[PDB]
Amino acid sequence: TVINNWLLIEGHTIGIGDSIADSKTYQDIQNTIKKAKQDVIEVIEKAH
Amino acid sequence: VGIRFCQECNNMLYPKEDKENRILLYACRNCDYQQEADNSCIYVNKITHEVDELTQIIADVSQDPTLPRTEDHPCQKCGHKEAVFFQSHSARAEDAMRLYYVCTAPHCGHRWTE
Ligand SMILES: [Zn+2]
Ligand SMILES: [Zn+2]
User: Fold this and answer.
1) Residue B83: left (phi > 0), alpha (psi -120 to 50), or beta?
2) What is the helix (H) or strand (E) element at residue A41, kind and residue range?
């Protein structure tokens, strides 16, 4: 009871801005994915 | 070694031992045709199956538009740049990833393995 009635003041929500990250973080993620794909290509070439 | 047929009823030859001359011969039990064997082998068994698949793959596979093809590896006899490559199909070998190459041009049916 008491914490629901306090949460009436602060409130809570979820939205798109909670799921959007930084532009530098996006670049880091893309670099990591490209490096991983290049490594899998290298492994495939080693087996080939 | 492989199958051969009697020349009068076209039935199987199978091997017999001549006891007097002590030589092997082939006799078709539906008749009396006896023919001396020229191969001294009656049965062979390639247990490890180390036969390269070049004879199983056909040159017509070059016309498949869904197969991959690279310019890196040239053919030996003609040197056409284009060559489609694909994997093994033997189920039972010490290896499972080697690429079989077939030359892509219409008349050069050259197949080789790197
Ligand atoms: Zn016969
Ligand atoms: Zn060729």
Assistant:
1) beta
2) helix A23-47
Q: Position B22: which residue type?
A: R
Domains of chain B: 1-45 (no CATH), 46-114 (2.20.25.10)
Of B27, B30, B35, the residue nearest B9 (C-alpha) = B30
**Strands of B14-17's sheet in order across:** B14-17, B24-27, B34-36
**Nearest residue of A to residue B113 by CA position?**
A48
d(CA B37, CA B87): 40
In 3D, which of B93, B83, B81 has the Cα closest to residue B49?
Answer: B93
DSSP state of B98: P
- Residues 77-106 of chain B whose Cβ lies under 8 A from any Cβ of chain A: 97, 99
Q: Identity (one letter) of the amino acid at B57? A: I
